[PDB]
Amino acid sequence: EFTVSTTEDLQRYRTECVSSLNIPADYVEKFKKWEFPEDDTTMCYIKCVFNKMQLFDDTEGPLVDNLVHQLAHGRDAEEVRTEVLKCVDKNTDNNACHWAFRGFKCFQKNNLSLIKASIK
Numbered sequence: 001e002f003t004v005s006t007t008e009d010l011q012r013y014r015t016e017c018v019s020s021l022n023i024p025a026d027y028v029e030k031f032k033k034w035e036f037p038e039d040d041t042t043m044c045y046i047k048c049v050f051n052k053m054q055l056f057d058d059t060e061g062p063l064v065d066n067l068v069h070q071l072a073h074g075r076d077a078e079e080v081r082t083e084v085l086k087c088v089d090k091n092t093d094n095n096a097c098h099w100a101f102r103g104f105k106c107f108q109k110n111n112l113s114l115i116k117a118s119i120k
């Protein structure tokens, strides 16, 4: 049921989320440059994209098995899973947007290369 996301999948999901959340043009400009402001508009966008990629569920949180499928082929699944699990936490402030974004920010600090490589 999980399918890995390609570059085109991700571009479609970006477009869909910009549409459905009515993301302002200024934010889109920033997302294109990999700039993600610390605000609800951005956080809900990332949640939206992750929902569509089947990498995050609003109730269960990060979908670790799916993240490993997305990121790890050709690499050491154990290493990747370990790095993912370091960024997996509880929904302590009962906010799926905050939750999804926190995990993204955690992971991309040290694993940006792995993220970019996953999108072929």
Ligand SMILES: CCCCC/C=C\C/C=C\C/C=C\C/C=C\CCCC(=O)O
Pocket (backbone or CB within 6 Å): 010, 014, 031, 032, 046, 049, 053, 055, 062, 067, 070, 071, 084, 085, 087, 088, 103, 104, 106, 107, 108, 115, 118, 119
């Ligand atoms: C437990 C924390 C897990 C966080 C994992 C981080 C990223 C997901 C991993 C692989 C999927 C690849 C790209 C999606 C990443 C960011 C959204 C792009 C937004 C945009 O470009 O407009």
Ligand SMILES: [Co+2]
Pocket (backbone or CB within 6 Å): 068, 069, 073
């Ligand atoms: Co797999």
Ligand SMILES: [Co+2]
Pocket (backbone or CB within 6 Å): 078, 081, 082
């Ligand atoms: Co392990």
